[PDB]
């Protein structure tokens, strides 16, 4: 099933979004992509996620002239301990000269319709998360 999903991601144009757990670091081969979004952190793996990012994104023809041909986004929760984890982790990449721009406002979210538009939906998500106890 993993290989079938990988082949669908590589070949099927309808599916271009794959969710990968921690196994995406070295347990298998990462297909060439252009957008990598990191939501969850190990807790300060400054080298593991850097290696994962290096492995995920490869050179793409067509956008060689542009200085921004591969896109990486790190979703970090404000005022949380995830801020410290991200700051500690990105130190290795900053030592390599990689820049990191902080984006607090996303342009286009107001026009586009997204899930949890109403606050009661967010209350339902909170109920679901609280239902997931410390066991998960």
């Amino acid at each position: 099933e993993r290989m079938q999903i990988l082949q669908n991601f590589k070949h099927n144009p309808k599916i271009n979004t794959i969710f990968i757990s921690k196994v995406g670091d070295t347990s298998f081969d990462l297909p060439e992509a252009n957008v990598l979004i990191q939501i969850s952190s190990h807790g300060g793996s400054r080298r593991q996620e850097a290696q994962r990012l290096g492995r995920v994104l490869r050179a793409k023809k067509g956008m060689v002239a542009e200085e921004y041909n591969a896109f990486f986004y790190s979703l970090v929760s404000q005022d949380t301990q995830e801020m410290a984890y991200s700051t500690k982790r990105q130190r290795f990449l900053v030592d390599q000269g990689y820049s990191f721009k902080v984006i607090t406002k996303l342009a286009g979210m107001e026009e586009e319709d997204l899930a949890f538009s109403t606050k009661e939906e967010q209350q339902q998500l909170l109920q679901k998360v609280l239902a997931a106890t410390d066991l998960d």
Binding site: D79, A131, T133
Partner: protein, 504 residues
């Protein structure tokens, strides 16, 4: 031109449907042909039962007394041991002139066969050939002659002690001792011929009368095993008589016809001709003397022709080839990628050599002996257990599920017992039955295995309850959690919470 994967899937589905339909058709054909063959066998059994009934009716004492009264005094004074061909011929000639053929007489189905025969005796007329044969059989049994009624699915067989032979008698044409004439004037095409004695015993006498017995009839008859089982209850107690009949048949059929047709030579132990031999058969020795020529094809001795098994299957059959034996015959093999390499390279199609060793080259497989609590293993780490004798000395095979885990917990050697191979899925998957363990450590291990089972018997329901407990806990928390939010609750905020009240 559009979704080639979909087209391939459609073609594969059509192929699978066609294969399944062909399988259903061939299964239906197999069932129908089996039903037809069983129906033919049942019809043959019905004819045999009718012959039994006719023979039983012919054994009545009243009919014998009537026949003896009818028989003239010149025939009643001859002992059965003094009966020869001339006496039988004279008796047949008298019988023909005594009873005539008259089918115009009334034939009522209500009249029993014994009553019908008594009426025929009273009128001295025969409705048909069957009644004439029955009357002649009654006449023969009147003199207490050892006579058998012979039917082709009819005539009589008389046992003469002067030559100790069964002489055929046909009263229809006045024929005595001419099996060829009886074969010519017999019933519908001859496949089985059975002779029933007055005592009820049945003997196969098709060989004596059929000249095509050894070539066409032999391949067109019923199963030998089923027929032998059917005739086993009615085997004649005269074992010496049966042996004499078999010897006479063998003497008659020992290379008497000498056919020259190629097709008759194919698949025949009597002849053992040329290339028509099977793929797994060879000639041992290769210097077999030529027994004849058939259109340029040499005849060899069947005793010199043997079926040869492979060394692997020799081991499977608990036999070991002698060391250094040259493979007598080289054949092809059907196996995994090792065989499939012939498909890639055609030049290796005939290069694949499999040595089929003969029985003379294989002596016996001697199972090893377990030493120092160690189970012997093959080249692949297992033990071949196709036969019980193949089990190594000091080893016991145990059919205990999850026994290997217990053995490893106790650090006890555990070897799989290979018993067969499954050819499903296009590959010969091995089949194992139980584990081979040392006998000295057997019983204690069994107890531990039982203890392990007891562990499961102790450690199953508990864990189930544990799951339920967690569920209950979860359920409780759920309510509390919802209730908690009720205690709390029973885009402007998000878009502009922290980084807007100062930027804007």
């Amino acid at each position: 031109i559009e979704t080639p994967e979909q087209a391939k899937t459609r073609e594969r589905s059509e192929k699978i449907k066609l294969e399944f339909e062909t399988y259903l058709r061939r299964a239906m054909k197999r069932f129908n042909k089996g039903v037809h063959e069983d129906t033919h066998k049942v019809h043959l059994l019905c004819l045999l039962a009718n012959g039994f009934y006719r023979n039983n009716i012919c054994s009545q004492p009243d009919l014998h007394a009537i026949g003896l009264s009818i028989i003239p005094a010149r025939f009643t004074r001859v002992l059965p041991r003094d009966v020869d061909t001339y006496y039988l011929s004279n008796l047949v000639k008298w019988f023909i002139g005594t009873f005539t053929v008259n089918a115009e007489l009334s034939a009522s189905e209500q009249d029993n066969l014994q009553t019908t025969l008594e009426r025929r005796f009273a009128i001295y007329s025969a409705r048909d050939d069957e009644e004439l044969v029955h009357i002649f059989l009654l006449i023969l049994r009147a003199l207490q002659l050892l006579t058998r009624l012979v039917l082709s699915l009819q005539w009589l067989e008389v046992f003469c002690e002067q030559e100790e032979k069964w002489v055929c008698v046909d009263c229809v044409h006045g024929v005595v001792g001419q099996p060829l004439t009886c074969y010519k004037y017999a019933t519908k095409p001859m496949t089985y011929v059975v002779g029933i004695d007055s005592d009820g015993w049945v003997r196969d006498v098709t060989q004596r009368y059929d000249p095509v017995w050894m070539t066409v009839t032999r391949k067109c008859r019923v199963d030998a095993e089923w027929w032998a089982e059917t005739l086993r209850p009615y085997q004649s107690p005269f074992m010496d008589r049966e042996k004499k009949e078999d010897l006479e048949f063998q003497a008659k059929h020992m290379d008497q016809p000498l056919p020259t047709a190629i097709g008759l030579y194919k698949n025949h132990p009597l002849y053992a001709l040329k290339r028509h031999l099977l793929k797994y058969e060879a000639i041992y020795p290769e210097t077999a003397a030529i027994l004849g020529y058939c259109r340029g094809e040499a005849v060899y001795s069947r005793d010199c022709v043997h079926t040869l098994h492979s060394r692997d299957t020799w081991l499977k059959k608990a036999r070991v080839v002698r060391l250094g034996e040259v493979p007598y015959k080289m054949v092809k093999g059907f196996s995994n990628r090792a065989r499939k390499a012939r498909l890639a390279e055609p030049q290796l199609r005939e290069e694949n050599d499999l040595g089929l060793f003969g029985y003379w080259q294989t002596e016996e497989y001697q199972p090893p002996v377990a030493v120092d609590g160690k189970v012997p293993r093959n080249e692949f780490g297992n033990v071949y257990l196709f036969l019980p004798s193949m089990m190594p000395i000091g080893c016991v095979q145990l059919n205990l599920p999850n026994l290997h885990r217990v053995a490893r917990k106790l650090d006890i050697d555990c070897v799989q017992a290979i018993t067969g191979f499954d050819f499903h899925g296009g590959y010969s998957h091995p089949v194992t039955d139980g584990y081979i363990v040392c006998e000295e450590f057997k019983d204690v291990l069994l107890t531990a295995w039982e203890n392990e089972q007891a562990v499961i018997e102790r450690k199953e329901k508990e864990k189930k309850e544990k799951r339920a407990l967690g569920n209950w806990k979860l359920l409780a928390k759920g309510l509390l959690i919802r209730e908690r939010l009720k205690r709390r609750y029973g885009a402007r905020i998000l878009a502009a919470s922290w980084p807007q009240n100062r930027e804007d």
